């Protein structure tokens, strides 16, 4: 339904647009994965690569049957950032915050059970 798509887009836009107390947009690095030719090491280590552009494409093309499916893909993105990057590094830390930002956005926008 158009309502579900509106909610998914509103949730992902909250995640994308989020800035920390310093005004930095944390999603910046995660919008588009570097190409396989630029960073082959990433694709050698990460089995299911995904970025925010792909998640937007999947919402747009009606590929998520529920908000749970959308969540699964956002969590996979953050997991891959944490798998590839060192614990304590900025990319690693940013992905942890974005998991939390998605959950707050889902609770606020969707107002479920
Ligand atoms: C147009 O911009 C697209 C990205 O541009 C880039 C960015 C590159 N970077 C190198 C180091 C910093 C930045 C982002 N980097 C990473 C990106 C990601 C990543 C990006 C999107 C989605 C999930 C991810 O885990 N994960 N770990 C990284 N270390 C790779 C390397 C080559 N092209
Ligand atoms: Zn690049
Ligand atoms: Zn459509």
UniProtKB/Swiss-Prot annotation:
Binding site for Zn(2+): 62, 79
Residues in Bromo domain copies: 1-109
Post-translational modification: During apoptosis, cleaved by cathepsin CTSG to produce a 160 kDa cleavage product which localizes to the cytosol. Ubiquitinated.
Tree of life domain: Eukaryota
Cellular compartments annotated: Nucleus
Disease annotated for this entry: Nicolaides-Baraitser syndrome: A rare disorder characterized by severe intellectual disability with absent or limited speech, seizures, short stature, sparse hair, typical facial characteristics, brachydactyly, prominent finger joints and broad distal phalanges. Some of the features are progressive with time.
Family: Belongs to the SNF2/RAD54 helicase family.
Subunit structure: Component of the multiprotein chromatin-remodeling complexes SWI/SNF: SWI/SNF-A (BAF), SWI/SNF-B (PBAF) and related complexes. The canonical complex contains a catalytic subunit (either SMARCA4/BRG1/BAF190A or SMARCA2/BRM/BAF190B, mutually exclusive) and at least SMARCE1, ACTL6A/BAF53, SMARCC1/BAF155, SMARCC2/BAF170, and SMARCB1/SNF5/BAF47. Other subunits specific to each of the complexes may also be present permitting several possible combinations developmentally and tissue specific.
Stated role: ATPase involved in transcriptional activation and repression of select genes by chromatin remodeling (alteration of DNA-nucleosome topology). Component of SWI/SNF chromatin remodeling complexes that carry out key enzymatic activities, changing chromatin structure by altering DNA-histone contacts within a nucleosome in an ATP-dependent manner. Binds DNA non-specifically. Belongs to the neural progenitors-specific chromatin remodeling complex (npBAF complex) and the neuron-specific chromatin remodeling complex (nBAF complex).
Protein name per UniProt: SWI/SNF-related matrix-associated actin-dependent regulator of chromatin subfamily A member 2
Gene this protein is translated from: SMARCA2
Shown residues within the full chain: 1380 to 1510 of 1590
